[model samples]
Target: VINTFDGVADYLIRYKRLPDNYITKSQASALGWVASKGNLAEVAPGKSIGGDVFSNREGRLPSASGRTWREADINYVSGFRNADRLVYSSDWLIYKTTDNYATFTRIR
Candidate 1:
């Protein structure tokens, strides 16, 4: 059976909290999901956008009509968790792993 894996990666590019190159996993109703932003949300300031800060400002959320879930569909409530030292994705088809990507591996 295929399972979605959500957690930090092997290594983030030095400072960036993401891999040097990345991958996305999709399934039914979740494809062509751009190499860009997926279920992830810019809910707050980051290393560059503000350098570790929190704001109450509201950003726009995506809709289901265009093949994206509403911002309402994401948040601290939905995403990966701090599994040890890995940042996890709560629950989104785009930002996830199938069975922890242990079987079918990347050929790159």
Candidate 2:
């Protein structure tokens, strides 16, 4: 995982930029926001086919030999995403975002 919002709850916190509480709004990015929602699952060749794949609310992790595909549950992320972002908040949190900030989940 790259970044997250308290289990889909973070996006609704109402910041100066995202006053409407909607990720679909055009003005949501001035203060950093995700444009869409995501989910937690055992991403993969198949769910739970490998014991190494897991989603413990911290992240979705797969073993080195285990295969994974992004967004196994959310809307299909269909863009070319070779580039990624790392964000540091005031609380000393580290995270990543992609697809114009549409999906953020946390790294560390």
Candidate 3:
């Protein structure tokens, strides 16, 4: 309902943050996700891991004030996960990486 990437990105651009309803990978798995099928709707209908923590362990992304970043795995639902992710912070900063977080480009 947001854009080609669906709800997360558009919501972020408009409100400067993700909706409170976004789920996480752990939450999805607990709901019976097998990664063989994107059955997220079966358990948590209208829910997705659009706002899960993105641990900047490599220290590749810029950080300040220790605001944690969030991640949304692109094309995951269709089983075409290509290591592309949209990373964002609580302060409304947005970035995208196609190399599985190896590189980033600020979008907003």
Candidate 4:
């Protein structure tokens, strides 16, 4: 599945969409995914949590009217999630953040 920053970013850049393996947070949650326990692998095998709206509460990324942001995990292992993430905007602006949104680097 697309679990790397480059992989997800490239997929989005080429297809203008998230990969098939991505699932919304609610979907994952419904499947028994616990963020604190990182139980995604047990609940939903071969699936990655994604497509959930990112509030951008920190205002780390650019802001504009109607530009909603979404996030996906990158380099996620079985038990625990790392700091890496792929944040994309509705306008197709893609970014990679290895520091969990503390910083970001534009990818598209």
Candidate 5:
């Protein structure tokens, strides 16, 4: 549905919501996804992992009161998860990180 970096960012910026195919990490786990094995496709076909709360422990992204962040995979393939992710906040700020949170580029 919204797997690419720009695709996810544009959808969130324009629609202010995640795509229907997104599922939380817990939901994916429930469906038999093993983080180490990258078993999402085997467990839940066509579903993408997302909606998990992102703890900005590294302080790489901006922060504010009541601004919670969530993360989703970008350009995700079937075998393994990549470093690319879409980190978006409750306040509508969106960012893309290609280095697994090492750096971020603002999308909104």
Candidate 6:
């Protein structure tokens, strides 16, 4: 069976949704998490995935009429994070992609 993983997985498992008041790169920068430096753990413990726009620019996924994708890193370890991604749409459709954005499986 599919299981909830770590990183954003914990947040999603506990809250069944994204982290409350998730910060963006700009906001994180203000909180001392440099985008280029990668200090997310220092600013927020166990928080590797924050609010960031995942444009799906590669056209890897199907083209939707009115949907945009946002992504969060799952089970991030050290400076090197796995290619897994938890992508959510504006309409609340959530998907899990282990092979980066190359493929995705719907979670709900």
Clashing pairs in 2: 2-96, 2-106, 3-104, 3-105, 3-106, 4-105, 5-10, 35-101, 35-102
Reference-based TM-score of each model = 0.16, 0.23, 0.71, 0.91, 0.92, 0.65
Which regions of candidate 2 deviate over 4 angstroms? 1-83
Where does model 5 exceed 4 Å of error?
none
Candidate 4: 10-residue stretch with minimal lDDT: 73-82
In terms of TM-score, which candidate is strongest? Answer: 5
On lDDT, the stronger of 2 and 4 is 4
Error of 3 at 65 (Å): 1.6
For candidate 5, give the lDDT. Answer: 0.87
lDDT of 6: 0.65
Q: Write the per-residue lDDT of candidate 2 for residues 1-104, one digit (tens) a residue.
A: 21223322243223312112122222223333233421112122111100121222343322233433222122223222223433333332334455433556
> Which of candidates 1 and 4 is the stronger one according to TM-score?
4
Candidate 5's displacement at residue 38, Å, is 1.7
Give the TM-score comparing model 2 with the true structure, all chains together.
0.23
lDDT per residue as tens, model 5, 23-55? 998898888889898788788887788888999
lDDT digits (tens) for residues 4-38 of candidate 6: 34445556655666665355566666777765676
User: lDDT tens digits, residues 80-106, model 1?
Assistant: 321211122222212222332222222
lDDT of 4 at 29: 88
By TM-score, rank the candidates, best first.
Answer: 5, 4, 3, 6, 2, 1
Model 1 ranges with Cα > 4 A deviation: 1-10, 23-31, 34-85, 88-108
- Candidate 3 lDDT tens digits, 31-99: 886666756667666555666778888988788886889887654444324577788887777788888
- State the C-alpha lDDT per candidate: 0.23, 0.29, 0.70, 0.87, 0.87, 0.65
- Candidate 5 versus truth, CA RMSD in Å, comes to 1.2
lDDT at position 93, candidate 5 = 86
Better of 2 and 6 by lDDT: 6
